Design an enzyme around this catalytic site. Structure first.
Site, mmCIF file in Angstrom:
data_model
loop_
_atom_site.group_PDB
_atom_site.id
_atom_site.type_symbol
_atom_site.label_atom_id
_atom_site.label_comp_id
_atom_site.label_asym_id
_atom_site.label_seq_id
_atom_site.Cartn_x
_atom_site.Cartn_y
_atom_site.Cartn_z
ATOM 1 N N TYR A 182 0.831 -1.207 0.000
ATOM 2 C CA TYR A 182 0.000 0.000 0.000
ATOM 3 C C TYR A 182 0.871 1.265 0.000
ATOM 4 C CZ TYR A 182 -3.157 3.800 1.139
ATOM 5 O OH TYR A 182 -3.851 5.011 1.111
ATOM 6 N N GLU A 183 2.000 1.199 0.696
ATOM 7 C CA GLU A 183 2.915 2.330 0.778
ATOM 8 C C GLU A 183 3.853 2.435 -0.432
ATOM 9 O OE1 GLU A 183 4.505 1.744 4.694
ATOM 10 O OE2 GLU A 183 2.928 2.926 5.624
ATOM 11 N N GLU B 297 5.315 2.516 14.573
ATOM 12 C CA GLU B 297 6.013 2.271 13.304
ATOM 13 C C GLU B 297 5.090 1.782 12.168
ATOM 14 O OE1 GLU B 297 8.848 3.042 11.886
ATOM 15 O OE2 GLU B 297 8.131 1.980 10.102
ATOM 16 N N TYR C 177 -1.846 -1.162 10.452
ATOM 17 C CA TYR C 177 -2.517 -1.659 9.252
ATOM 18 C C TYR C 177 -3.742 -2.492 9.600
ATOM 19 C CZ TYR C 177 -3.240 -4.482 5.001
ATOM 20 O OH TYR C 177 -3.779 -5.129 3.918
ATOM 21 N N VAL C 178 -4.830 -2.235 8.877
ATOM 22 C CA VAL C 178 -6.031 -3.067 8.894
ATOM 23 C C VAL C 178 -6.313 -3.480 7.450
ATOM 24 C CG1 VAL C 178 -8.545 -3.152 9.380
ATOM 25 C CG2 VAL C 178 -6.996 -1.952 10.950
ATOM 26 N N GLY D 41 -13.677 -0.436 7.801
ATOM 27 C CA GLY D 41 -14.827 0.353 8.245
ATOM 28 C C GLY D 41 -15.210 0.190 9.706
ATOM 29 N N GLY E 161 -13.702 0.316 12.634
ATOM 30 C CA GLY E 161 -13.077 1.073 13.723
ATOM 31 C C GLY E 161 -11.927 0.359 14.420
ATOM 32 N N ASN F 265 -0.341 10.371 1.102
ATOM 33 C CA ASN F 265 -1.394 9.495 1.625
ATOM 34 C C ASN F 265 -2.495 10.301 2.311
ATOM 35 O OD1 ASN F 265 -2.983 7.388 2.527
ATOM 36 N ND2 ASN F 265 -1.432 6.463 3.846
ATOM 37 N N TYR G 253 -5.730 11.334 10.632
ATOM 38 C CA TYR G 253 -4.870 11.846 11.698
ATOM 39 C C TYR G 253 -5.213 13.283 12.077
ATOM 40 C CZ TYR G 253 -2.069 7.727 10.446
ATOM 41 O OH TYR G 253 -1.611 6.447 10.148
#
Lengths: 166, 154
Positions: free
Chosen positions: A34-35, A92, A95-96, A102, A104, A133, A140
């Site tokens: 993803y990153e 560091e 991730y989900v 969705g 939480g 991102n 955040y």
């Protein structure tokens, strides 16, 4: 015609154990992908198992599960502020898996790290985000976290690190 | 010059240096701790944080403060250097402190030695560039502290 309604699952957060290593590595790869950095993951399962769970490892890992069935993870360690004269926590990896973004889980992992920080007399909870991102940045920003944009992180690794030591 | 691990007796000198560094970094007012607070945290039994003293002929001339990080990509510990400072009258002590940290990184199987610099601090940037360090400038550090931290916990 269609109908929307709320579903409710019980989710679990627990400290990770050595047997979680293969799943943790799996998730590390998914996050790195993803990153846009899949190729940067150069460790293997035994590397993770040994380093993450060594006696006196500075690092801690949490698993998030649904009747688990792991759905996410976090890796963190303690930092220090000389200005506050207080420890802090640095997160560091968080991730989900997309399927479960969705419910939480990500937010609760972050909340539990905040509780740990407050419980352990820490001044700061911190982490880093890629500047492109926007979904993560939006999240955040929304919880009151503030960017430390005056600072640039520098790194010595590989040959440059070896030469500095030699 | 001598590099040695800091001991609880160094706390006074460490704080004086911390303030000197913060002052340079335009952040003197951010140092809200006292020597007691440094002692209780930096030198707590089981502390994850370490400090190095740099001395010239028994006189303390500089310091570093660091802790262990972790790279999930490398599957390896790293070291993060929080503070590095040499007093003006002695400015190659800084390079020597870094060398010791690098040696510690190598001996302890670390993949990375890292630290941060203020974007306006060109002298520090110039020095770091000169030792082969590279900027990780795609990342932004985020922080919760104060009320926002307390409220998130609750």
């Amino acid at each position: 015609e269609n109908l929307y309604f709320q579903g409710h699952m019980t989710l679990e957060i627990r400290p990770a154990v050595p047997a979680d290593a293969e799943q943790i590595l799996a998730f590390i790869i998914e996050l790195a992908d993803y990153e846009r950095a899949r190729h940067e993951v150069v460790t293997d399962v035994e590397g993770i198992r040994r380093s993450l769970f060594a006696e006196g490892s500075p690092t801690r890992a949490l698993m998030c599960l649904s009747e688990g069935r792991p759905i996410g993870y976090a890796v963190f360690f303690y930092s220090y502020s000389t200005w506050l004269g207080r420890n802090g926590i640095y997160l560091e990896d968080l991730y989900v898996t997309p399927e479960y973004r969705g419910v939480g889980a990500g937010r609760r992992l972050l909340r539990e790290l905040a509780r740990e920080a407050v419980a352990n007399d820490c001044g700061r909870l911190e982490w880093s985000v890629l500047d492109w991102n926007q979904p993560a940045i939006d999240f955040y920003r929304s919880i009151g976290a503030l960017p430390q944009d005056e600072w640039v992180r520098y790194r010595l690794d590989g040959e440059a690190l070896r030469k500095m030591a030699e």
